[PDB]
Ligand binder design. Structure first.
Ligand SMILES: [Zn+2]
Length: 284
């Protein structure tokens, strides 16, 4: 099986273009391009990555596809389009090559997520994506999970990927685990929803710094994801470079590696570390 980092970003940094990079986030306020990622993947023996839109514009899609062209180490792109546009189909057709495998909108930043996802024009777009075998990545905060339950139940025609295991409020674990878990189980009950094991270190209190107690809390979330989704619907992702707010690329991968060695068979680990990503994103 392929060994895939299923979730990473790239950017030529400009402050105004990335409003979510704010104060206390200096590590992110610079360019992150494929050259910077490849040594880290090499050290983890990961052969390829999936690059995911980091801002909302068609030019982000063009940027990522350009980086991915002729670069075997970028296996796919999850791009951005305005899914509500009537023009969606003809716009998607503009993209050349085969590496555009899915889309993502930053739902978490919307004022009314439920209103956003149930919107007729958005539903039309997502329906078109699914009819055309494009994956959709779901990005929400833990408390927004109930807001997308109906959306996920409705759009069952192709794979929906839950980013970062739905962002459990790890900084609160000292009702939080319970609430997130109930929402996670309800989503995992749908066969077409799969789960990224990624983006966990930055849901702990990284500003004050990660502690052993956070690592144990993360393992609880990993265990809950495995219970709900099963071993065939889990995929590793680094969430680099965002993960660097809290931990190194090596620390992020090792955390999942140690957990998987404990809880998974060899075959199940191969699925976790790339097989599931390859089958859901239709990676060659
Ligand atoms: Zn991310």
């Amino acid at each position: 099986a392929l060994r895939i980092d299923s979730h990473q970003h790239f950017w030529r940094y400009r402050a105004a273009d990335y409003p979510w990079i704010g104060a206390g986030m200096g590590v992110l306020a610079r360019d992150y391009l494929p050259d910077a990622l490849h040594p880290l993947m090499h050290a983890q023996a990961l052969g390829a990555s999936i690059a995911v839109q980091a801002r909302a514009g068609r030019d982000e899609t063009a940027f990522l596809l350009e980086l991915a062209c002729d670069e075997a180490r970028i296996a796919a792109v999850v791009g951005w389009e305005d899914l509500r546009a009537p023009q969606l189909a003809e716009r998607v057709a503009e993209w050349r090559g085969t590496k555009l495998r899915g889309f993502r909108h930053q739902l978490q930043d919307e004022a009314d997520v439920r209103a956003f996802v149930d919107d007729a024009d958005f539903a039309r777009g997502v329906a078109w994506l699914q009819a055309n075998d494009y994956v959709y990545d779901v990005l929400v905060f833990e408390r927004q999970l109930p807001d997308v339950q109906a959306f996920c139940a409705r759009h069952d025609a192709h794979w929906l990927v839950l980013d970062h295991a739905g962002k459990p409020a790890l900084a609160e674990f000292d009702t939080a685990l319970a609430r997130w878990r109930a929402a996670l189980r309800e989503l995992a009950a749908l066969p077409h929803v799969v789960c990224k094991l990624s983006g966990l270190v930055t849901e702990a209190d990284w500003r004050r710094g990660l502690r052993a107690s956070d690592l144990r809390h993360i393992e609880q979330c990993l265990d809950a994801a495995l219970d709900a989704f099963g071993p065939q619907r889990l995929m590793f992702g680094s969430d680099w470079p965002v993960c660097l707010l809290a931990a190194s690329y090596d620390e992020v991968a090792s955390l999942v590696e140690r957990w998987a060695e404990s809880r998974l068979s060899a075959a199940e680990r191969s699925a976790l570390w790339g097989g599931t990503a390859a089958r859901c994103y239709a990676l060659p």
